[PDB]
């Protein structure tokens, strides 16, 4: 297959079991950007379900999902992984025909505790490869409370740093760069900064823009504190918290201000195919004080199966240090990782920054495992900038897609470390074939 259809769902189940029928959740029918126009269901290739306050036992729950999907699609979807941590649970299921294509499956979980609050907060994860394309899925439940934004941001950073999904050799990189596509979703619990009656007025009008301008997740993302260079599809569904059970007619009630607690975000390597086909919530599933949120994505995949030469590399790096620096290059297209020599020039007209330059002589050629053009296009390099005394100052990713040829092509990208922008990097390179 050339592309796959990925379903992501997030639902705080409110410590009661689901209703018998959750079909709207699976088929992206409800409010927001929806697939209500689709009369005959196209079964997705991969279903991913993240839940919180899921008080159904692991085994029984996975069975309910397999059962639900069986009745909808007339297919025995196979669960490749599942992972729970208290009542935070994720499960990933694939079509039977894709079972051979999956490999390198891992799971992880992380606790993020804070004193004097209701704990049981943290995250669970699943990653795998679909042929040559790596996928990461994170399901979390962060700290609740209107005034706990700083605590939520810290939960995010603790997850980003501690969650050990994927290959170990990528331990200079965190989960924001380990996977071709990363989906981070769950009960993020960021809230609306507005009085209760004024918010209910806007929900009645279906005027979401004035509420989105006071959404705490949106504001923190603009400050560059969480979810650096992630995407979220535009929100056009009402707040998913907090409803009275048995209906969606009525919000319950600053401790119960309506909010978009339940969210899906993604982070992709550059020059890859990824389109969001839905992002919304149901309005006919009423067992929880939250509503289920869905998202679907069309995602490109690459089959499973010559040298790379750099003219020069130049990095603006954020630091007070003045030592020498080098680069390590990692990729799944390489047999072993390579390293550069010392940088051979450096300058600065800023106390906080440093320009660091590697000439062609200081940079090694990389030798890929296959010489096929169609293979090489779909690959990426992971670069980490390290100092000579030795910890990383910055990581980034570079696509080879437009770099295939005889003459060297320009690249420019951002450097990050531990959820902070730490500079940029640029250079000139070619992937040559004989």
Curated annotation (Swiss-Prot):
Induction: By bacterial lipopolysaccharides (LPS). Widely expressed, most prominently in skeletal muscle, heart and brain. Present in platelets. Expressed in transformed myeloid cells and in primary macrophages, but not in peripheral blood monocytes. Coiled coil: none annotated. Interacts with tyrosine phosphorylated form of SHC1. Interacts with EGFR. Upon stimulation by the EGF signaling pathway, it forms a complex with SHC1 and EGFR. Interacts with cytoskeletal protein SORBS3/vinexin, promoting its localization to the periphery of cells. Forms a complex with filamin (FLNA or FLNB), actin, GPIb (GP1BA or GP1BB) that regulates cortical and submembraneous actin. Interacts with c-Met/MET, when c-Met/MET is phosphorylated on 'Tyr-1356'. Interacts with p130Cas/BCAR1. Interacts with CENTD3/ARAP3 via its SAM domain. Interacts with c-Cbl/CBL and CAP/SORBS1. It is linked to Genetic variations in INPPL1 may be a cause of susceptibility to metabolic syndrome. Metabolic syndrome is characterized by diabetes, insulin resistance, hypertension, and hypertriglyceridemia is absent. Belongs to the inositol 1,4,5-trisphosphate 5-phosphatase family. Phosphatidylinositol (PtdIns) phosphatase that specifically hydrolyzes the 5-phosphate of phosphatidylinositol-3,4,5-trisphosphate (PtdIns(3,4,5)P3) to produce PtdIns(3,4)P2, thereby negatively regulating the PI3K (phosphoinositide 3-kinase) pathways. Required for correct mitotic spindle orientation and therefore progression of mitosis. Plays a central role in regulation of PI3K-dependent insulin signaling, although the precise molecular mechanisms and signaling pathways remain unclear. The SH2 domain interacts with tyrosine phosphorylated forms of proteins such as SHC1 or FCGR2A. It also mediates the interaction with p130Cas/BCAR1. This is Phosphatidylinositol 3,4,5-trisphosphate 5-phosphatase 2. It comes from Homo sapiens. The chain holds residues 421 to 875 of 1258 of the full protein.
